[PDB]
Design a protein around this ligand. Structure first.
Ligand SMILES: Nc1nc2c(ncn2[C@@H]2O[C@H](COP(=O)(O)OP(=O)(O)OP(=O)(O)O)[C@@H](O)[C@H]2O)c(=O)[nH]1
Ligand SMILES: Nc1nc2c(ncn2[C@@H]2O[C@H](COP(=O)(O)OP(=O)(O)OP(=O)(O)O)[C@@H](O)[C@H]2O)c(=O)[nH]1
Ligand SMILES: Nc1nc2c(ncn2[C@@H]2O[C@H](COP(=O)(O)OP(=O)(O)O)[C@@H](O)[C@H]2O)c(=O)[nH]1
Ligand SMILES: [Mg+2]
Ligand SMILES: [Mg+2]
Lengths: 427, 48, 430, 430
């Protein structure tokens, strides 16, 4: 019944996934040894969505971990919750990442994909009504960026009906960490547009901004940085796992947010966030949550929605609240700022409520939106790629792996068409 | 018989009136329970 | 010996259903389990010993809401076969609910309903509960009604569904499902009542002094109306009204069946102590547009048919006086070709309150059922909203991929346009 | 049976009633909660068990005074829906309260008054209170009276309003509010009585030993007059006097309706035991300008109509002797075309005192209402003051910015002038 299979690719995906599993394991109440020790019976109604059962009351998540280098898993195995994952599911090669899209896609991708497909096929048969697949990867280097596209294409070929959802990290406009990111992101966009039904984009620069503005954390690390991303993933699936006054699964969200097949790239937000010393002052209620969610500061995608126009958006609430209070909020915010929303799609903001809140928080909410502000992110990489590719001889590193230069122009042609499509639907 | 109408009004209207004035009494402590539950969770969040 | 059968479809239909059986168990006087600590045959079926089973069927593609009742306090009252659950939501897609997922569970529910009808030897009528915005409520509802229309023939299939609120909307594809569902109701539904949450929110905030309402309060107020509607068949009264009588008088034609509903007196506990609430006062409060559970002003339209139901210590003389006083109001418009317009019914069983409830101590209460041309205002809003979507084809690809043919949309648009023309033609005078 | 409805506007209207309801609940004998340890319909409506509710609606644009009643001891007596409070007051601006702020809440109050009148089947008239100098008092009352003229037509709309004092004033823009209120009042009001604060201030020490009274003492004196006026409707009497009887006799012409008011004997708790206070004392002392409650000397003007209302041990023989002796007073002048000019009414119920109050245990008392041309002295002062303001356009910008059209000021000035000429023409002899 509506099970979910989780896939983690590369260095960034594994570290995000490690924090991701820690949050859910605490939420359901799973001891690090793998035995249930929780306090409320409601934790065990729908543990089958993310957890499998072993003989003797031991639970093992449906986690498939993929990397080309051994080092990341050594950290994954050595982690606090490393013993929870199934040892056989750790699938890997024995070569360097290469920091290249073409090397990952062609040379080692073919060798690894067959083993990965069989391992995933094992978990795919261990679920009656597997709703869809979940991927966590980055578009920067090429290990996750390159192999993830090939894996996502194969998954679509095998399972066209299932809802393919990915959480991708885009190269930051200023804190970029590779001389050749624009090529990797540009090549990855072409497969992402046609294959994945739902795509969520997160930028590191926005996360640094959010932590420094709200959390006031002097020395942020990736663990604190990935903590926020873990809450966004946990909030999305909360409808499946717990009762609510208005259940809203992923296929509900895909129908509402997507007006046309190619317009499916989304921005997500989380609230509430508060510095560890300022939470005394705050009368946290529903209107306060609405103020945070729609505030541009909380949006972890480095694109101001105000410069663009809003398409359909959805908000998910966790906890106990009045249904009337929620409805009035989405009515007021939609009518107050009508300039932001497109006129020809009223009822832009979809609401949904889940009963059980996350630990400690009296109430929590999640925001997902679709807007034309993504043209700014694509404009940045297009400008960098244009000046980057003008010196056509730097392509030689990808040519060694079999990449012909005409692939780069076709990929830019496709994303240029996506940019034009986003321009046209502005009016 | 208007006297039986009065008795019916005592039994229907006013005997049930005693019931839900006990229920708005019950409303009093459930709001107190709401304060208790929200309070208890509050120093738990304070502890975290 | 006089049975009624109720069907609950979708998240909304189950939730309101949970509210009314809360009311029925105390009003009939049984434990939550079904054992006694009359009218019971009308609503409940008798198994053996001293335990009872309700004549209800719960259907949803979402297992979550059904499982809550399965693990609830009232689980043993409900027979396990009566609780039917699917695997996944209809994604609020009418195509998905009506064609792809609905056909895989339609036969299982139909067999159970037919099985349950065999024991109801003296049955008349059905009750089916829908939310219009939800895919399961509309997609599964339409397919079920199409089957039930031919399965049982001359049976009074009464419905009571939640029309979309004029501004408060939780689903973006809501106009699509509402129009497509409305097309099937107007062809296969004998009589279907409407509500909207926004009007309920306003009334329960204004009439009752309740801080911030939830779906629970709305369901109970919904639960009271259906109980008053079915109170005639359950207890004795000076004027008993059968479901056939409602069908004859409420509708003057076939396609103009759509009625409106009102209830009074909606009053809190402390307010009842400070008032006296005779028959005239409760009669006067009904016609006020404030208490109308659909956000449409009756002054914009006219009245053709009205029906009134009374519970408690109501005396026939006062009812005639109250009706006479209402007729003197020039603010209420009636067509020339229907001077009578009114049917009154009186029942001696007082309303019943719920422990930890919301409603007050009223010994005498009145239910309002009527039809007005003001309902055309809401139809115009839905028609205008739908035209905005279909002008740019904003959500066509989701539905077409689920097996539904794009030519169905213009046909439903034409059917709605004909309905509005029919209402305007009826509202005209010679 | 026969009922009277009270409507209160502004800070003045609320706290005058607070005193009145204290006197009136005690004088009929009902507890603050509405229970007991007749003529109840006159200002109570009756509710279910023993609870009584007053036939009143309290309206003010500032919630401060209304919240005092909500938290005061008398919270149990009044129904919460009768206590309507606004958001922000009219800010001593007639234009603000007439157009911007008054029109936001006018519809709510008009529904409340109409709903209350249904329980008041034998309704005979409305009593309305205003403050002339205030913004909410005068500004909102004008709109209220204009709507009531078409809502109810031929119904006695009597009023009790505080006219600005000749010299004592607590508002700079007070003349502007008075003239505009005067224009609205003179057209629709059937008969509006006037009192002023300064004469209340003077008598409260001259008639009884209170060195520094407050608004509390003044309100008690007013309520005694109101109680005496409505006593004939409330108890047995040798000469019944109804509201229409006052309306016909008091006014000889349409625009000359404005009567004067005074009361006697007003006496301290010790003084009362030192004097007989017979019939001759109470009638003779009434005509004195010291007992006059509007600071205009009757010797300047003429008498055209007088009304006498008695409560106590009054014997008709003494009334005839007192009236005959009054007619022998050469200090009192009467118009030749009105030879009699007197109507007398006798009621048996003595006035009821309030513990901790200001009056004494007078065995017999009397209230007089009259119409005199000496009021013309008062109007000319307001006319002269308004001319001084508008000569230099003192406060035009405030009122204009709130929507009022500047052409109304000359129109209101002409209306005041026309009333002045009408009084002189009537006072002229032939
Ligand atoms: N008044 C009231 N309305 C409810 C309640 N529960 C659900 N609804 C209505 O149901 C509508 C949406 O339908 P869903 O809750 O998604 O149920 P569904 O019919 O299965 O819809 P899908 O799952 O999308 O196919 C909302 O707009 C609500 O107005 C309730 O308890 N009270
Ligand atoms: N005699 C007497 N007069 C009062 C009393 N309370 C208020 N007033 C009169 O009310 C007049 C002005 O009232 P305000 O409250 O300032 O104004 P308003 O009529 O309420 O209208 P706003 O300007 O909107 O406040 C003053 O001139 C007072 O004479 C009272 O208790 N006794
Ligand atoms: N937020 C976050 N970013 C990470 C983490 N680990 C790596 N990254 C980022 O991921 C980007 C590319 O990582 P890389 O090893 O090349 O992954 P690959 O694309 O699969 O090859 C780098 O710029 C890192 O900044 C992490 O734990 N958290
Ligand atoms: Mg649903
Ligand atoms: Mg005031």
């Amino acid at each position: 019944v509506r099970e979910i299979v989780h896939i983690q690719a590369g260095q960034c995906g594994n570290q995000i996934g490690a924090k991701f599993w820690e949050v859910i394991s605490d939420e359901h109440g799973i001891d690090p040894t793998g035995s249930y020790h929780g306090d409320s019976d409601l934790q065990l109604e729908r543990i089958n969505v993310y957890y499998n059962e072993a003989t003797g009351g031991k639970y093992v998540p449906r986690a498939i971990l993929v990397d080309l280098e051994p080092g990341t898993m050594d950290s994954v195995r050595a982690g606090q919750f490393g013993q929870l994952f199934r040892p056989d599911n750790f699938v890997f090669g024995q070569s360097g990442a290469g920091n290249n899209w073409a090397k990952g896609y062609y040379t080692e991708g073919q060798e690894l994909c067959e083993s990965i497909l069989d391992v995933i096929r094992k978990e795919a048969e261990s679920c009656d009504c597997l709703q869809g697949f979940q991927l966590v990867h980055s578009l920067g280097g090429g290990t996750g960026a390159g192999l993830g596209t090939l894996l996502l294409n194969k998954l679509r070929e095998e399972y066209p009906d299932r809802i393919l959802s990915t959480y991708s990290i885009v190269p930051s406009p200023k804190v970029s960490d590779t001389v050749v990111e624009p090529y990797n992101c540009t090549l990855s966009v072409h497969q992402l547009v046609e294959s994945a039904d739902e795509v969520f984009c997160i930028d590191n620069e926005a996360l640094y901004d959010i932590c420094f503005r709200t959390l006031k954390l002097t020395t942020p690390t990736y663990g604190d940085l990935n903590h926020l991303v873990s809450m966004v993933m946990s909030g999305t699936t909360c409808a499946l796992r717990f009762p609510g006054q208005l259940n809203s699964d992923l296929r509900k969200l895909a129908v509402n947010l997507v007006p046309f097949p190619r317009l499916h790239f989304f921005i997500v937000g989380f609230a509430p966030l508060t510095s560890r010393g300022s939470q005394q002052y705050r009368a946290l209620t529903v209107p306060e949550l609405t103020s945070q969610l729609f505030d541009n500061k909380n949006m972890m995608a480095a694109c101001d929605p105000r410069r663009g126009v809003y398409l359909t958006a959805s908000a998910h609430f966790r906890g106990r609240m009045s249904s009337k209070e929620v409805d009035e909020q989405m009515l007021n915010i939609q009518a107050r700022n009508t300039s932001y929303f497109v006129e020809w799609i009223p009822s832009n903001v979809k609401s949904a409520i889940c009963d059980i809140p996350p630990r400690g928080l009296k109430m929590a909410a999640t925001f997902i939106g679709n807007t034309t502000a993504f043209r700014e992110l694509f404009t940045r990489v297009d400008s960098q790629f244009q000046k980057m590719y003008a010196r056509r001889a730097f392509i030689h590193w990808y040519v060694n792996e079999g990449l012909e230069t005409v692939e780069f122009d076709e990929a830019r042609s496709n994303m240029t068409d996506l940019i034009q499509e986003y321009e046209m639907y502005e009016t | 018989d208007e006297v039986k109408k009065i008795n019916s009004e005592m039994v229907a209207a006013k005997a049930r009136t005693f019931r839900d004035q006990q229920l708005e009494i019950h409303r009093q402590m459930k709001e107190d329970e709401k304060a208790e539950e929200r309070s208890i969770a509050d120093m738990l969040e304070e502890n975290r | 010996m006089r049975e009624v059968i109720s069907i609950h479809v979708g998240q909304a239909g189950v939730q309101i259903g949970n509210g009314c059986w809360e009311l029925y168990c105390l009003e009939h006087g049984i434990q939550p389990d079904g054992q006694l600590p009359d009218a019971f045959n009308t609503f409940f079926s008798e198994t053996g010993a001293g335990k009872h089973v309700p004549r209800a069927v719960f259907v949803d593609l979402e297992p979550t809401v059904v499982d809550e009742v399965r693990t609830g306090t009232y689980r043993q009252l409900f027979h396990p076969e009566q609780l039917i659950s699917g695997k996944e939501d209809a994604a609020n897609n009418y195509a998905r609910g009506h064609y792809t997922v609905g056909k895989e569970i339609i036969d299982l529910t139909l067999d159970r309903i037919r099985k349950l009808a065999d024991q109801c030897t003296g049955l008349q009528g059905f009750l089916i509960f829908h939310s219009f915005g939800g895919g399961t409520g509309a997609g599964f509802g339409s397919l079920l009604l199409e089957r039930l229309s031919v399965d049982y023939g001359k049976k009074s299939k009464l419905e009571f569904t939640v029309y979309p609120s004029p501004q408060v909307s939780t689903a973006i594809v809501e106009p699509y499902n509402s129009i497509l569902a409305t097309h099937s109701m107007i062809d296969h539904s004998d009589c279907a009542f409407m509500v909207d949450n926004e009007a309920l929110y306003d009334l329960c905030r204004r009439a009752l002094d309740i801080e911030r309402p939830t779906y629970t309060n709305l369901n109970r107020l919904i639960g009271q109306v259906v109980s008053s509607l079915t109170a005639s068949l359950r207890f004795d009264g000076a004027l008993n009204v059968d479901f056939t009588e409602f069908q004859t008088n409420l509708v003057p034609y076939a396609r103009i069946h759509f009625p409106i509903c009102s209830y009074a007196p909606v009053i809190s506990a402390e307010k009842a102590y400070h008032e006296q609430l005779s028959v005239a006062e409760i009669t006067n409060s009904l016609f006020e547009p404030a208490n109308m559970m659909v956000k449409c002003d009756p002054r914009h339209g006219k009245y053709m048919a009205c029906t009134l139901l009374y519970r408690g210590d109501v005396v026939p003389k006062d009812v005639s006086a109250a009706v006479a006083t209402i007729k003197t109001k020039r603010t209420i418009q009636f067509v020339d070709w229907c001077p009578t317009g009114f049917k009154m019914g009186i029942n001696y069983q007082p309303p019943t309150v719920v422990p930890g409830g919301d409603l007050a101590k009223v010994q005498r209460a009145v239910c309002m059922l009527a039809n007005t041309t003001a309902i055309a205002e809401a139809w115009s809003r839905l028609d205008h909203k739908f035209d905005l979507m279909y002008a740019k084809r904003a959500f066509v690809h989701w539905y077409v991929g689920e097996g539904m043919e794009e030519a169905e949309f213009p046909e439903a648009r034409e059917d709605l346009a004909l309905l509005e023309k029919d209402y305007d033609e009826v509202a005209a005078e010679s």
